[PDB]
């Protein structure tokens, strides 16, 4: 026995946390109130037939928190773990990092500290947020360094909604993205991808949902986190811990930004049309378009590859499929990283939702790597930042939060050094 803590900041973070808790509740049979020992990794035993999520819901705006506390799962969540803000940063990293974040970071730090107090087997921290959101950038970053300074070497996992190259809710998104990336770089143990446009494209072409909604995105995150945490929440042939995830993909602290991909995303009518075998599902998932990242991995080199099989998957078939994956030349690896393969097998089949886009299947695989194509996105973001900051636009907004342009500039050069480190 062991536990983990999930952190949700901003609208995207709150929605993601709610969806993930919906998964964890329906997978273990939790009714909306909390009733009917691996489920203790995310829920706490007190009283009689009771469980509550080990999470904190915080946002500078109370709209999403109000929406959460109006669902049928009010009884499921403790009221005190929901935090309501008053002044949304409005896509401003500095606003949510200094003006409102500094006076509300205390209660959250403080009581996630108790969440660790009753969880002596705290494996790590889960963070869900968005770069585009000013709250989800600033408050998330500051609480990230607060976690680092209050826990030391404790493992921490970040799930960030990176704005897409052509999808941006706010035009000031480069400022928030660059600022948060420079601020939390040294402490970000592992940060993933989310490309909204790639999610929409995959849903429209794979699930063939011409009119999807953010619920599809919500379980897109939900299924990813479920596949990641199945090892901790269910036994398997070779379970994988959170520590090994950062051990394999962080030989150097500078590069800790791996991309994620799921296989498969198939509707029930199309699930009738295809049953999964290891070779086909892996080679489909390794296909660049199947990746939920809008960056072709074949442009650069591959760091490492991690497989997360769940269900009735034969390890020998895994080895054979992975080998025949290796031999083909569409896949290339760095010279000094010949053997960077880790496989995690779990016996728990992926869980379905009623009325969901995904089809109920006994087996699945999670696609886990850190390709060099992320450098393309980083360079494009840096170029956009240079263009839109060259005339110094929207800077006065961050100035009114009380800093001058210097920190913007050296964050730009820090991220440039990160980009050229490849």
């Amino acid at each position: 026995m062991r536990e983990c803590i999930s952190i949700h900041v901003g609208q995207a973070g709150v929605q993601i946390g709610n969806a993930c808790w919906e998964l964890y509740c329906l997978e273990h049979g939790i009714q909306p109130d909390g009733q009917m020992d691996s489920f203790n990794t995310f829920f706490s035993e007190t009283g009689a037939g009771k469980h509550v999520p080990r999470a904190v819901f915080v946002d500078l705006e109370p709209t999403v928190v109000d929406e959460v506390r109006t669902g049928t799962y009010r009884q499921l969540f403790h009221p005190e773990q929901l935090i309501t803000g008053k002044e949304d940063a409005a896509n401003n990293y500095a606003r949510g990092h200094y003006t409102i974040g500094k006076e509300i970071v205390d209660l959250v730090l403080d009581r996630i500290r108790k969440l660790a107090d009753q969880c002596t087997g705290l494996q790590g921290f889960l963070i869900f947020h968005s770069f585009g959101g000013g709250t989800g950038s600033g408050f998330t970053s500051l609480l990230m360094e607060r976690l680092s300074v209050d826990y030391g070497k404790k493992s921490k996992l970040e799930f960030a909604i990176y704005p897409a190259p052509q999808v941006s809710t706010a035009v000031v998104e480069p400022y928030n993205s660059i600022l948060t990336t420079h601020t939390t770089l040294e402490h970000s143990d592992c940060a993933f991808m989310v490309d909204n446009e790639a999610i929409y494209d995959i849903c429209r072409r794979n699930l063939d949902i011409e009119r999807p909604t953010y619920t599809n995105l919500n379980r897109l995150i939900g299924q990813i986190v479920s596949s990641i945490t199945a090892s901790l929440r269910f036994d398997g042939a070779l379970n994988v811990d959170l520590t090994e995830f950062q051990t394999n993909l962080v030989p150097y602290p500078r590069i800790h930004f791996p991309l994620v991909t799921y296989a498969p995303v198939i509707s029930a009518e199309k699930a009738y049309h295809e049953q999964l075998s290891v070779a086909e599902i892996t080679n489909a998932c390794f296909e660049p378009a199947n990746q939920m990242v809008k960056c072709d991995p074949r442009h650069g080199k591959y760091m490492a590859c991690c497989m997360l099989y769940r269900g009735d998957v034969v390890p020998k078939d895994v080895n054979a499929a992975i080998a025949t994956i290796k031999t083909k030349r569409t896949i290339q690896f760095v010279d000094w990283c010949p053997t960077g393969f880790k496989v995690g097998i779990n016996y728990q089949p992926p869980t379905v939702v009623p009325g969901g886009d995904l089809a109920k299947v006994q087996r699945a695989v999670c696609m886990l790597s850190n390709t060099t194509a992320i450098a393309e996105a980083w360079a494009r973001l840096d170029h956009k930042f240079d263009l839109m900051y060259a005339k110094r636009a929207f800077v006065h907004w961050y100035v009114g939060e009380g800093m001058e342009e210097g920190e913007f500039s050296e964050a730009r050069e820090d991220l440039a050094a990160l980009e050229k480190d490849y």
Binding site: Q11, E61, P62, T63, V64, E67, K86, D88, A90, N91, N92, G134, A164, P165, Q166, V167, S168, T169, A170, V171, V172, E173, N196, E197, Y200, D201, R204, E210, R211, P212, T213, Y214, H383, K384, L387, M388, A390, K391, R392, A393, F394, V395, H396, W397
Partner: protein
């Protein structure tokens, strides 16, 4: 939560605010008296932003009515939905500045500033959290501009952190309704560059031509102008008032629209706008709107953005569609309008969607954009001011209210610096 207090100045401003209030009563399911009858919880869940907690299951608008004459007062109160306002919010003068900025700002504004500050402070304190303000007035008029300037000054010195927008009505360049209206615009802009966080410029002749041609009406009236104004109204404020997959508020727009403190003038937008025998034949799809987002026909404040360059664009949508189509449409808009767009502000389209469409339309689209086209309007205003200030005509009315020469000189210098900065951006 995030309460917004409405203050209306001038006859046009009072009419606009009233029409807004009936439109909000439609959108939130409020009858002519104040009772709620909406069929969905979404209308009444966030009714507190524009309404207050009234006894007997009622709701009253969070509005402040200010004028120097009670003529439009009586017409508005005796008009439709006049009983939804308490008599206390109606505070009026008895002299009238007579389309004079100095009179309405110093002579008659001296005995109205106390009342307007008292009522706005009462509205602010009686609410939970005042997110911001919204003011409507006409820069062509003299009194309304003076009330706008006085209120923005008092708000800035009282609530420097609470942002707002001002929906001022700039006088039409083609028609000189008032001889001394250049002074009014001069002083109003000189106070707006200084006491307002962001401003939308609403020009008459552009909406007149839209009603004439796009709507295909042979008899345009103030009613249609107030209707389109209320559509702009709802389009900007629906993200805060109604739940959305991409939630937004006035603070988000202000952050996304203001690159420099003095560069805060934007030109609002609405679409689709089609008649009965075109709507049943037009495509009710996004491309029909994206061809309508960028055009000098359905264009709001009479200065063509094609001559200048767009600063950045904000687009709010209300309906049932996916988001990726919007993103690719915005990308295509950049791809084809690159020359009309700015090269050094990549992805300058602000994309957000409110889930709930307005009453009677399953889409509405509000085009919030900024371009250096307003440079032409400001330069023409400056040259007109120079033209009839070189002759020193009609200065006696202002100098009789405690005016001075070099004051107007630094006013015109401020607009000169503003237009020079806008040209430098161009």
């Amino acid at each position: 939560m995030r309460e917004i207090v409405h203050i209306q100045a001038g006859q046009c401003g009072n009419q606009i605010g009233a029409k807004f209030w009936e439109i909000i009563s439609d959108e939130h399911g409020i009858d002519a008296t104040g009772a709620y009858h909406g069929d969905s919880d979404l209308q009444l869940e966030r009714i507190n932003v524009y309404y207050n907690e009234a006894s007997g299951g009622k709701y009253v608008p969070r509005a402040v009515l200010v004028d120097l004459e009670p003529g439009t007062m009586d017409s508005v109160r005796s008009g439709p939905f006049g009983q939804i306002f308490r008599p206390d919010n109606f505070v009026f003068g008895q002299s009238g500045a007579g389309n004079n900025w100095a009179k309405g700002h110093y002579t008659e504004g001296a005995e109205l500033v106390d009342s307007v500050l008292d009522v706005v402070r009462k509205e602010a304190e009686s609410c939970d959290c005042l997110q911001g303000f919204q003011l409507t007035h006409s820069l062509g008029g003299g009194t309304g501009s003076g009330m706008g300037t006085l209120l923005i000054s008092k708000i800035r010195e009282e609530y420097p952190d609470r942002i707002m927008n001002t929906y001022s009505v700039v006088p039409s360049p083609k028609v000189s309704d008032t001889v001394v209206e250049p002074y009014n615009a001069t002083l109003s802009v000189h106070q707006l560059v200084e006491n307002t966080d962001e401003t939308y410029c609403i020009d008459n002749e552009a909406l007149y031509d839209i009603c004439f041609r796009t709507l295909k009406l042979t008899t345009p009236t103030y009613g249609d102008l107030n209707h389109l104004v209320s559509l702009t109204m709802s389009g900007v404020t629906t993200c805060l008032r109604f739940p959305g997959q991409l939630n937004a508020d006035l603070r988000k727009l202000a952050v996304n629209m203001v690159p420099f403190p003095r560069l805060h003038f934007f030109m609002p937008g609405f679409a689709p706008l089609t008649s009965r025998g075109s709507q049943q034949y037009r495509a009710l799809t996004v491309p029909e709107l994206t061809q309508q987002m960028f055009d000098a026909k359905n264009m709001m404040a009479a200065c063509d953005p094609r001559h200048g360059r767009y600063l950045t664009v904000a687009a709010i949508f209300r309906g049932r569609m996916s988001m990726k189509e919007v993103d690719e449409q915005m990308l295509n808009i950049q791809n084809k309008n690159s020359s009309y767009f700015v090269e050094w502000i990549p992805n300058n389209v602000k994309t957000a969607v409110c889930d709930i469409p307005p009453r009677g339309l399953k889409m509405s689209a509000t085009f919030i954009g900024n371009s250096t086209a307003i440079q032409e309007l400001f330069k023409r205003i400056s040259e007109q001011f120079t033209a009839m200030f070189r002759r020193k005509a009609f200065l006696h009315w202002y100098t009789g209210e405690g005016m001075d020469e070099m004051e107007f000189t630094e006013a015109e210098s401020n607009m000169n610096d503003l237009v020079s900065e806008y040209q430098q951006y161009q």
